[PDB]
Amino acid sequence: AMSLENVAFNVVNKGHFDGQQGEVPVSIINNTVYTKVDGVDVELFENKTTLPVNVAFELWAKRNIKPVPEVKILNNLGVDIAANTVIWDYKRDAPAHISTIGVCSMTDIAKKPTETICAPLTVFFDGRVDGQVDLFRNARNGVLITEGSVKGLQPSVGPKQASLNGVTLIGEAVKTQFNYYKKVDGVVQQLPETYFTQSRNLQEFKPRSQMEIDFLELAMDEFIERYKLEGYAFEHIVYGDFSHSQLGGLHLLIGLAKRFKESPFELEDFIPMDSTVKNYFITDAQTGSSKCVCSVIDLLLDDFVEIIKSQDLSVVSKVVKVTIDYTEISFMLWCKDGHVETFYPKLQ
């Protein structure tokens, strides 16, 4: 018994769609959904999507409010659609997927993921919901997350963090670390060994190891000395070079966080979406050093040190592929006389 007024009733009374009966009066003006309170219109939702306002309002109300994988993980695993839920992409203020299964009559391609339309699509399944592990076993293509063991299925331990209502966190009162499973063409796929990005913010950056604590506290030369990083170009790659008009290196989020404590900078997110590697048009406010496309990855400093120290430094230019968030990230490694000149997530 789906309706705009019923979705609005649930939003007003339950904070989201909760299957409750009831209707509140709604008015739609342009891309905004309002409801009357004390005789005046109160905004319930502003449509920032390319879907019609009432359709986007319903998908947002029907968003998954449990800790879910971050959209970058779902994308890296090739997820096309979710089974009977909406994964809301808070970085885009829009549904992470184009279509739905058993969610909304306007976006639904099927009511159940067992319908033949879903067979070619990689359907996301949530083992925490009854019957979804079985649906993944019956699905030709899919990604499954579970909180525990699935008999006979070899697991892949995912990242410690998950997104709960747009807040990325490592759960203490809830479980955020899932087992991951993927199927392509009816065959369970072995997920590769992977590093995970840490999903931290520049403003609220917290070190997650003794090496990261030492990077933020120690001066550049004493950190590079303590961790035997001479010849690995951390001065350029991690700390950043702000002496020329073109900003040098600065590809690790921890390096940007260290710089940010001393002086501010503009980070233009010209493709605003969740991704393992981010590209920013950066402008350093103190110096005026800038770079149109500065690729940044948030790896734990220990993980980045392990990656760079595991490379052969005998060639001028070389592509280094590293698995991060289940995707293969190409890095461009530049060496001279057995030392690193630069190492960065390869542009385009």
Q: Given the rule CB under 6 A, which residues bind ligand VWG?
A: 127-128, 133, 146-148, 150
Distance CA 73, CA 157 (A): 12
Query: Known catalytic residue: 251?
Result: yes
**Which of the residues 242 through 271 are near a second copy (CB under 8 A)?**
242-245, 247, 264-266, 268, 270-271
Distance CA 221, CA 211 (A): 14
Under rule CB under 8 A, residue 227 binds a second copy: no
- Residue 321, annotated ligand binder? no
User: Please, are residues 59 and 103 in contact by the beta-carbon 8 Å criterion?
Assistant: yes
- Which string of DSSP letters, residue by residue, matches 64-105? --S-B--HHHHHHTT--EEBSSB-EETTTTEESSS-EESS-T
| Token duo for residue 33 | 């959904």
**Which of the residues 70 through 129 are near a second copy (CB under 8 A)?**
75, 80, 89, 92, 94-98, 105-106, 116-117, 120
Nearest CB to a second copy, comparing residues 316 and 319: 319
Query: Known catalytic residue: 236?
Result: yes
Under rule CB under 8 A, residue 130 binds a second copy: no
Distance CA 100, CA 126 (A): 15
- Residue 326, annotated ligand binder? no
- Residue 335, annotated ligand binder? no
Under rule CB under 8 A, residue 290 binds a second copy: yes
User: Please, are residues 344 and 252 in contact by the beta-carbon 8 Å criterion?
Assistant: no
- Residue 345, annotated ligand binder? yes
Under rule CB under 8 A, residue 171 binds a second copy: yes
- According to DSSP, the residues that pair with 7 across neighbouring strands are none
Kindly state the greatest CA–CA separation across the chain: 75
| Token duo for residue 212 | 């990261």
Give the β-pairing of 123-126 and 142-146: parallel
Per-residue binding string, a second copy, 53-72, x by CB under 8 A, is: xxx---------x-x-----
Distance CA 203, CA 123 (A): 35
156 binds, among ligand VWG, a second copy, none (CB under 5 to 8 A by kind): none
Give me the residue label for tokens 């359709």. 55
Under rule CB under 8 A, residue 50 binds a second copy: yes
Query: Known catalytic residue: 339?
Result: no
133 binds, among a second copy, ligand VWG, none (CB under 5 to 8 A by kind): ligand VWG
- Residue 90, annotated ligand binder? no
| Residues noted as catalytic | 236, 251, 291
